[PDB]
Design an enzyme around this catalytic site. Structure first.
Site, short mmCIF file in Angstrom:
data_model
loop_
_atom_site.label_atom_id
_atom_site.label_comp_id
_atom_site.label_asym_id
_atom_site.label_seq_id
_atom_site.Cartn_x
_atom_site.Cartn_y
_atom_site.Cartn_z
N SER B 59 1.16 -1.48 -0.10
CA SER B 59 -0.23 -0.14 0.01
C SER B 59 0.74 1.02 -0.20
CB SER B 59 -0.93 -0.16 1.16
OG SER B 59 -0.33 -0.18 2.59
N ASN B 71 2.73 -4.67 -14.58
CA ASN B 71 2.38 -5.53 -14.78
C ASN B 71 0.55 -5.16 -14.27
OD1 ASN B 71 3.35 -6.41 -13.01
ND2 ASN B 71 3.65 -8.61 -13.76
N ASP B 77 3.59 -18.59 -12.15
CA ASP B 77 3.23 -20.43 -11.87
C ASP B 77 3.54 -21.23 -11.03
OD1 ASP B 77 0.37 -21.84 -13.21
OD2 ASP B 77 2.60 -22.05 -14.02
N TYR B 80 7.16 -22.16 -12.13
CA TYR B 80 8.12 -21.21 -12.65
C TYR B 80 9.46 -21.85 -10.80
CZ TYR B 80 11.08 -17.06 -12.52
OH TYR B 80 11.92 -16.35 -12.59
N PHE B 88 11.04 -11.15 -9.57
CA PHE B 88 11.49 -9.27 -9.69
C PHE B 88 10.09 -8.83 -9.59
CE2 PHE B 88 15.61 -9.97 -11.53
CZ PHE B 88 15.83 -11.53 -12.22
O1 DUD Z 1 5.56 -9.92 -11.55
C1 DUD Z 1 6.06 -10.56 -12.04
C2 DUD Z 1 5.15 -11.62 -12.84
C3 DUD Z 1 5.86 -13.02 -13.46
N1 DUD Z 1 7.11 -12.88 -12.74
C4 DUD Z 1 8.19 -14.55 -12.68
C5 DUD Z 1 7.24 -15.79 -13.43
C6 DUD Z 1 7.56 -15.52 -14.99
O2 DUD Z 1 6.84 -16.73 -15.38
C7 DUD Z 1 8.33 -15.07 -14.99
C8 DUD Z 1 8.50 -14.13 -16.33
O3 DUD Z 1 7.63 -15.12 -17.51
P1 DUD Z 1 7.76 -14.65 -18.94
O4 DUD Z 1 8.21 -15.47 -20.01
O5 DUD Z 1 8.33 -13.31 -19.10
O6 DUD Z 1 6.19 -14.86 -19.49
P2 DUD Z 1 4.92 -15.83 -18.78
O7 DUD Z 1 5.02 -14.87 -17.63
O8 DUD Z 1 3.42 -16.32 -19.56
O9 DUD Z 1 5.86 -16.62 -18.30
O10 DUD Z 1 8.32 -14.02 -14.31
C9 DUD Z 1 7.86 -12.23 -11.64
O11 DUD Z 1 8.81 -12.87 -11.44
N2 DUD Z 1 7.14 -11.03 -11.08
#
Ligand code: DUD
Ligand code: DUD
EC number: 3.6.1.23
Lengths: 128, 125, 128
Positions: B59, B71, B77, B80, B88
């Site tokens: 917040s 984003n 998921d 990962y 990140f």
């Molecule tokens: O805010 C976020 C969103 C995702 N990720 C991680 C999980 C994600 O799988 C990876 C980057 O994924 P990508 O291959 O860029 O695409 P997708 O989001 O379909 O995996 O970073 C983060 O660390 N922070």
């Protein structure tokens, strides 16, 4: 289950009943003007005690940007079951992309409740 | 149920119910107005089977740092979960800002993944 | 449980989903150019009838900022079960932080379903 809602004052518009599952619109408690590239915490004029084990999520409405030119700075707000104090009023954190005027009573964001995440043990490892 | 956490290095602050969980900057990161940086959080995690993580600012993140999360809400998921799959926070700076190693910058929770569902094409609704 | 999907026309790339409950990527229905500090509602070229008692949530893909320089102005879009009409097409509300171009077919945001919040009693109180 139930929500208890205290309003800031008698002039705040009472909100929608929740017997259908739709997200619920929340409204500006007072006139707020925000200049372009400035920020304002917009009062919503409401305090709530949410059911045990639940939290609320707040996002803008779909038409919020079109009408008011603001984004929500925390993306999605989380209100925990513990923010249930008599002074624990709700706010919409608004950053303006253009000069804007929000009027008292305007619907500015929306919320729903969700179950808080279950009990989890974090356990450190040296290698996945 | 359990989450397995690996930290980038020994200096990363170990994290810590039902509340969302604070994540922290793994290094100093300066970001100029109108510029973007991926802020490392110095954690990789193996979530429970059939669960995903959601990541949002805290917040007070905007008040303290003048950044927005590009984003909106990050989804991490179950898959990962590799040894190099570190998390990140994607930060856009609305003013010149300085994030320091160890600062709480965002927060996460887990949520069960969507149910099995079939997408069927129809030519009219 | 299923979702009925109608496409805007034949040229829209059909959207496949993973057996596992991964979020599902949606694509731009046409080539859209957005100038710095301008807003466009980016058509995704799909209309859907979600299962009864569910809603969809729409957020950007992690890579959308880096690839296209846009943020989603409503943070996270909520698509109700009720938005199931033959002309209820889905859109990604985009604000450009730089001059950009999004190509027809480009995967720009992602969605999942969630059960709608349960019926709840809203009950006003004079103090918490
Ligand atoms: O805010 C976020 C969103 C995702 N990720 C991680 C999980 C994600 O799988 C990876 C980057 O994924 P990508 O291959 O860029 O695409 P997708 O989001 O379909 O995996 O970073 C983060 O660390 N922070
Ligand atoms: O990111 C979004 C958010 C919503 N919608 C759809 C569903 C929504 O019903 C409609 C806008 O209608 P509204 O009546 O302004 O809002 P709502 O239905 O959210 O009250 O646009 C989108 O395509 N994308």
């Amino acid at each position: 289950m139930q929500i208890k809602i205290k309003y800031l004052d008698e002039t705040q518009t009472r909100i929608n009943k929740m017997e259908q599952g739709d997200w619920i619109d929340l409204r500006a408690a007072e006139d707020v003007a925000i200049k372009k590239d400035e920020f304002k915490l917009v009062p919503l004029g409401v305090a709530m005690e949410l059911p045990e084990g639940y939290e609320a999520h707040v996002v803008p409405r779909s038409s919020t940007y079109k009408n008011f030119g603001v984004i929500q700075t925390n993306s999605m707000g989380v209100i925990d079951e513990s923010y249930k104090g008599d002074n624990d009023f709700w706010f919409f954190p608004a950053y303006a992309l253009r000069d804007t005027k929000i009027k008292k009573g305007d619907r500015i964001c929306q919320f729903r409740i969700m179950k808080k995440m279950p009990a989890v043990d974090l356990i450190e490892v040296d290698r996945l």
